Design a protein around this nucleic acid. Structure first.
Length: 86
RNA sequence: GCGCGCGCGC
RNA sequence: GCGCGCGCGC
């Protein structure tokens, strides 16, 4: 979803912190790729994302991260609008 | 989104 | 001119 970044952002706003994205350019100058890593304080994991543009490199890293929060039972899937259970 | 400028390719 | 990206001003 577009909104996962916004979700992760809010999620951290509660435990009163910000995520931290770090993007680096990668691959084909003429058809290029970007690499993203997100971290959050107090969490032992780096969400990783690749894409053509930066936004999507970020979305992908965030998805990665949230998915992990769920795996480690810090969120329920059911609480992540993007992971649309319905 | 609209504008501008930049890189790479063709 | 076209394509993929990046950045900047509204």
């Amino acid at each position: 979803m577009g909104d996962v970044k916004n979700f992760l952002y809010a999620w951290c706003g509660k435990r009163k912190m910000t995520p931290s994205y770090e993007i680096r350019a990668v691959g084909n100058k003429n058809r290029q790729k970007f690499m993203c890593e997100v971290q959050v304080e107090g969490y032992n994991y780096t969400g990783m994302g690749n894409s053509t543009n930066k936004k999507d490199a970020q979305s992908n890293a965030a998805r990665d991260f949230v998915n992990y929060l769920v795996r480690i039972n810090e969120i329920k899937s059911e609480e992540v609008p993007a992971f649309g259970v319905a």
